[PDB]
Design a protein around this ligand. Structure first.
Ligand SMILES: Cc1cc2nc3c(=O)[nH]c(=O)nc-3n(C[C@H](O)[C@H](O)[C@H](O)COP(=O)(O)OP(=O)(O)OC[C@H]3O[C@@H](n4cnc5c(N)ncnc54)[C@H](O)[C@@H]3O)c2cc1C
Ligand SMILES: Cc1c2c(c(O)c3c(OC(=O)c4ncccn4)cccc13)C(=O)[C@]1(O)C(=O)C(C(N)=O)=C(O)[C@@H](N(C)C)[C@@H]1C2
Length: 365
């Protein structure tokens, strides 16, 4: 009722935006998703994503996808190693905790979410450039593509979104650490020494403020990442400059780690950043609009709370908009933002605290 004959547009077909789209569409809501990726076959780079039971899994449950998540996700243990290649601890998943926090490849999650939507709910190859209000509808401008309108816009285009001004003037800021990620295909062949060291579990190692993390089985490929405090001699279009840089930092590390670096094809550098939730968001806005996911609360990932929190937003907002407990769309948005600020600020605190704690000189897991 609240959203009757209201054309809702979600900006961004990431895991958060898609989940939002499903929760709305399964409630008989007219919802459109705009995604800049040219087609659905576009591969999503990055590691695996873990769904927390009180948040991520609850969102999939309400979307009717919980069993699909378990069907596709893979439970994984964790090994803590040192720079010399020794396994300090073995956290081999207990059978009884096997279905607590399994790991679903990012593309798999995109696929199940898309499959839960009606055909053509997502419009590919649509990069939103500007968002300008009218007396009654939004005007959405896409780069070299026809513009569109909407009554309510939900921003979900990531932590580096540039279309936030109408909601908040808050700016993204760097937290002081840097992450270098990569994928190795057929790791058993290219990096056998380090592959066997993982031995099915995910290796986390820290020495001299340089932390290493690895998932040996991300849909057949090994995804790993290296992080450290930041501050540039490195060009990421030049894997040679990256290797020289990493081998100097990892000179103290065992050759099996050096083998991992030497075989990596493409390096991806990213500074750790946060979209702080300190100051409240704009009070009066021209038309109904809000934000969800990383666009709302980017935070360091060292606490594994990013996607889990973003899904909480999609769950709360969609619930508020369809449970008939709010007199207006604006009030329903306000309530969501009130709730989101509370637990979202907490999540940021944990991720930053864990960040500072992990890259401290005394850290030892
Ligand atoms: C290195 C790293 C590791 C992480 N590890 C974990 C982990 O182990 N566990 C965990 O639970 N979480 C983890 N996270 C958090 C997780 O990645 C995010 O919280 C989650 O992906 C946010 O989803 P989202 O859709 O809100 O944003 P994103 O995932 O950034 O997706 C945004 C979407 O918007 C689209 N888009 C971009 N530009 C535009 C545009 N102009 N117009 C329209 N659409 C656009 C993008 O293509 C994409 O579809 C990690 C994050 C990082 C960076
Ligand atoms: C430190 C940390 C990492 C990861 C986590 O998932 C963590 C986590 O997640 C959960 O399991 C969980 N969440 C909520 C509820 C229950 N359980 C919880 C706590 C800490 C985690 C990664 O997966 C990681 O992405 C990873 O492996 C790689 C890589 N191999 O490339 C990265 O380099 C790292 N960073 C810096 C890019 C990441 C490290």
């Amino acid at each position: 009722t609240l959203l009757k004959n209201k054309k809702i547009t979600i900006i961004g077909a990431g895991p958060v935006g898609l989940t939002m789209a499903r929760l709305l569409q399964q409630n008989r809501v007219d919802v459109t998703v705009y995604e800049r990726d040219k087609d659905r076959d576009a591969r999503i780079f990055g590691g695996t994503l873990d769904l927390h039971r009180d948040s991520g899994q609850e969102a999939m449950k309400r979307a009717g996808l919980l069993q699909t998540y378990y069907d596709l996700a893979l439970p994984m243990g964790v090994n803590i190693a040192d720079e010399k290649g020794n396994i300090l601890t073995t956290k081999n998943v207990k059978p009884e905790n096997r279905f607590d926090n399994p790991e679903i490849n990012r593309n798999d999650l995109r696929t199940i979410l898309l499959n839960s939507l009606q055909n053509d709910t997502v419009i590919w190859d649509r990069k939103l450039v500007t968002l300008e209000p009218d007396k009654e509808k939004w005007t959405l401008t896409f780069e070299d593509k026809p513009s569109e309108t909407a009554d309510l816009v939900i921003i979900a285009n990531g932590g580096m979104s540039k279309v936030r001004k109408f909601v908040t003037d808050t700016e993204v800021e760097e937290t002081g650490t840097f992450n270098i990620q990569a994928d190795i295909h057929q790791p058993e062949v290219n990096c056998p020494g380090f592959f066997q060291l993982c031995n099915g579990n995910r290796l986390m190692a820290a020495h001299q403020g340089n932390l290493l993390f690895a998932n040996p089985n991300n849909n057949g490929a090994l995804h790993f990442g290296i992080s450290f405090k930041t501050s540039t001699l490195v060009d990421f279009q030049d894997r040679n400059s990256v290797v020289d840089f990493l081998l100097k930092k990892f000179s103290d590390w065992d050759e099996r780690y050096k083998e991992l670096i030497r075989v990596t094809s493409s390096f991806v550098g990213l500074a750790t950043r946060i979209f702080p939730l300190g100051k409240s968001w704009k009070s009066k806005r021209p038309l109904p609009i809000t934000m969800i996911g990383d666009a709302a609360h980017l935070m360091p990932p060292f606490a594994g709370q990013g996607v889990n929190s973003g899904l909480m937003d999609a769950l709360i907002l969609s619930d508020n908009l369809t449970n008939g407990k709010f007199n207006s769309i604006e009030e329903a948005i306000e309530n969501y933002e009130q709730q989101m600020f509370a637990y979202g600020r907490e999540a940021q605190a944990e991720s930053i605290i864990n960040e500072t704690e992990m890259f401290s000189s005394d850290f030892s897991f």
